[PDB]
Design a protein around this ligand. Structure first.
Ligand code: ATP
Ligand code: MG
Ligand code: ZN
Lengths: 289, 98, 216
């Protein structure tokens, strides 16, 4: 009996994430859908490389929304450019819902699995993935006839509990019962990350600018005054030195206050700013005439 | 061809419109900082909302109606004050050109 | 050259066909029945959906601009909240149920003692409605309405049907205690549709009994 081991990882390329999230956020109020291009290289990993967006239709996210003529023409056109990949699966956004599958999504994944029994389905929520966290969970239908054996039919491995823990938000909608998650792994390599780091890279001009001296002096004076008040507080606290269980005194007055947190951390920032400014100024007086 | 040209341009405008999405009409009630506002939807909760870059900070005074995006929850453009014959006082009565 | 024009016609015909199929497959159903409150200029309308939520539209959508008017009841998408198709009014069916033409014929012989009041109503309506040419010639503006104030049982409803009886008209009765509906924006729609219907028909009278139901 063939089985999808939990060590099977669906490889998503760097381009795939940016384009899939872009498609999700472009048609965010509705549920967008599209077809993912990839290769079933082996049993224990499913690699997707590129993806193209299925045009939005009033049906929503269903097998009807898949337009045969559009996908056929797109596949033929992409074949000439140097992308002879095979239909590897489908993705659809779940705005604010989370990472799970509806009954209609269940049937849609079933229809995809008819062509190939590793047709993965992934979900991308553009709203929850608003920061460094990207909520994207891949799913493949588990056959309802496999209840006699163990669901998640995996075999010798150790990566079932790693990289994720089955979410409560998705467990109640059916996990390890009708569909099971697949560990997500992103194929990022050099010559791709380096191009991506240019999002916020500054330039040669940055690092030599002297900021503005008027507001630099204003900020320095403000930080010095706040340090003077904090030093008054430090003097009071230290000179208090109350000895009725001083260890408990240090734990009954923890509210992110005077002693050290609003201490040298502020000295840290002012000293960093001052040394950086002075070093930059000296470097400019050296280089520029 | 010409009539087809006009109606096809109109149909393409309609096709572009189909992608366009709505904004919740909201009202600014406070300005915490120069990127922070307290906008209340017409019938909805209050959200801490930012402003689009191509928008003047000053114009969004307390009481300025706005139409923020309903996914990112960020102001996109100002709207003038709502007008309706909902006034409960006699001001809307015209004395008559006598 | 005529074959070139024919080829351009066929090409733009299939282009029209594909854009029309895209529009049709993006129309679908259902539509959120929404009431357009107003139309701001700076091709964008402020819609208040039936879900008691307002949604500004950057573009009007699959309709034409000057067709939409403040107060038009249209159908919009449930998610994108964009105008898809204008919904015909047809004055509902309840509004057309109030044009009752089985007037029980309160002839002025069936109302006694209320003689000067009958003549005052016939000076305020009927002749303004029937013999209007002299009314325009004089310059006497006929009052558009009359308020029937009196102690209960005086016969205000009776004389209303009376002057609806012997003076023809359609008698679009719009009694006040009817004009209170727990559905939001139904009574107001009822009044506006009643007046629009009165505009549609022949000379008629809009009659509202027990105005206190909305007149408080
Ligand atoms: N002047 C009148 N001549 C003949 N019948 C009358 C007269 N005034 C009242 N009636 C009769 O008395 C009853 C009063 O009902 P009606 O609704 O017509 O009066 P109303 O003063 O408008 O009532 P309400 O204020 O309670 O709505 C009716 O049955 C009507 O026929
Ligand atoms: Mg009465
Ligand atoms: Zn879905």
């Amino acid at each position: 009996a063939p089985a999808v081991d939990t060590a099977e990882q669906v490889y998503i390329s760097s381009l795939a994430l940016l384009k899939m999230l872009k498609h999700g956020r472009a048609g965010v109020p509705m549920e967008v859908m599209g077809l993912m291009l990839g290769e079933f290289v082996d049993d224990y990993t499913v690699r997707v490389i590129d993806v193209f967006a299925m045009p939005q239709s009033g049906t929503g996210v269903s097998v009807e929304a898949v337009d045969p003529v559009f996908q056929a023409k797109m596949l033929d056109m992409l074949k000439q450019t140097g992308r002879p990949e095979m239909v590897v699966g489908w993705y659809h956004s779940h705005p604010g819902f989370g990472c799970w599958l509806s009954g209609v999504d269940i049937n849609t994944q079933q229809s995809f699995e008819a062509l190939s029994e590793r047709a993965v389905a992934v979900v991308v929520d553009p709203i929850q993935s608003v920061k460094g966290k990207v909520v994207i969970d891949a799913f493949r239908l588990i056959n309802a006839n496999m209840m006699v054996l163990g669901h998640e039919p995996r075999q010798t491995t150790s990566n079932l509990g790693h990289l994720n823990k089955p979410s409560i938000q998705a467990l109640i909608h059916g996990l390890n019962r009708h569909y099971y998650s697949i560990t997500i792994n992103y194929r990022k390599n050099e010559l791709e990350q380096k191009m991506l780091l240019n999002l916020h890279k500054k330039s040669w001009m940055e690092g030599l600018t002297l900021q503005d001296y008027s507001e630099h002096c204003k900020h320095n004076e403000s930080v010095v005054k706040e340090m003077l008040e904090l030093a008054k507080n430090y003097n009071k606290a230290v000179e208090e030195e109350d000895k009725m269980t001083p260890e408990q005194l240090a734990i009954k007055n923890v509210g992110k206050q005077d002693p050290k947190r609003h201490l040298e951390e502020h000295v840290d920032v002012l000293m960093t700013s001052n040394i950086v400014q002075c070093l930059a100024a000296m470097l400019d007086t050296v280089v520029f005439k | 061809l010409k009539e087809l040209t006009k109606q096809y341009e109109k149909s393409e405008n309609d096709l572009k419109a189909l992608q366009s999405v709505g904004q919740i009409v909201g009202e600014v009630l406070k300005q915490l900082t120069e990127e922070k506002f307290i906008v209340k939807a017409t019938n909805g909760p209050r959200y801490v909302v930012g402003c689009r870059r191509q928008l003047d900070k000053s114009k969004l005074k307390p009481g300025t109606r706005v139409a923020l995006d309903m996914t990112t929850l960020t102001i996109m453009r100002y709207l003038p004050r709502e007008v309706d014959p909902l006034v409960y006082n006699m001001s809307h009565e015209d004395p008559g050109n006598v | 050259e005529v074959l070139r024009v024919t080829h351009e016609l066929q090409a733009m015909k299939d282009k029209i066909k594909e854009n029309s199929e895209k529009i049709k497959v993006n129309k679908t159903l259902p539509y959120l029945v929404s009431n357009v409150i107003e139309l701001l200029d700076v091709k964008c309308a402020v819609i208040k959906t039936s879900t008691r939520q307002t949604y500004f539209l950057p573009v009007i959508g699959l309709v034409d601009a000057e067709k939409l008017k403040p107060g038009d009841l249209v159908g919009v998408n449930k998610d994108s909240y964009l105008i898809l198709e204008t919904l015909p009014t047809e004055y509902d069916s309840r509004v057309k149920a109030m044009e009752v033409d089985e007037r029980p014929t309160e002839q002025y012989s069936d109302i006694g003692g209320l003689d000067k009041q009958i003549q005052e109503l016939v000076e305020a309506i009927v002749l303004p409605m029937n013999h209007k040419e002299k009314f325009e010639n004089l310059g006497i503006q006929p009052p558009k309405g009359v308020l029937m104030y009196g102690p209960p049982g005086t016969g205000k409803t009776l004389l209303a049907r009376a002057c609806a009886a012997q003076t023809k008209a359609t008698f679009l009765k719009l009694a006040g205690p009817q004009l209170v509906q727990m559905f939001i924006g139904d009574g107001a729609k009822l009044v506006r549709d009643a007046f629009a219907l009165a505009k549609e028909k022949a000379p008629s009278i809009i009659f509202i009994d027990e105005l206190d139901a909305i007149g408080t």
